[PDB]
């Protein structure tokens, strides 16, 4: 159970990081549009 529980915690961590990844890409494209 603790393993299935930990897996859920890891998956949620990856999904959270994925949002962060999208936000940094949005930041990069915004800055690139004005500097390219």
């Amino acid at each position: 159970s603790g393993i299935v529980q930990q897996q859920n915690n890891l998956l949620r961590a990856i999904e959270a990081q994925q949002h962060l990844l999208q936000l940094t890409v949005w930041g990069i494209k915004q800055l690139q549009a004005r500097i390219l």
Partner: protein
């Protein structure tokens, strides 16, 4: 850019909590294995 800032902190706080929760479950799961 202010929304991006808040969204960046929002997800950073959720990731901190999940990394911390996982850190604890890692210790508990290692304990249960023994």
């Amino acid at each position: 850019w202010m929304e991006w800032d808040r969204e960046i902190n929002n997800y950073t706080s959720l990731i901190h909590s999940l990394i911390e929760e996982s850190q604890n479950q890692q210790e508990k799961n290692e304990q249960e294995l023994l």
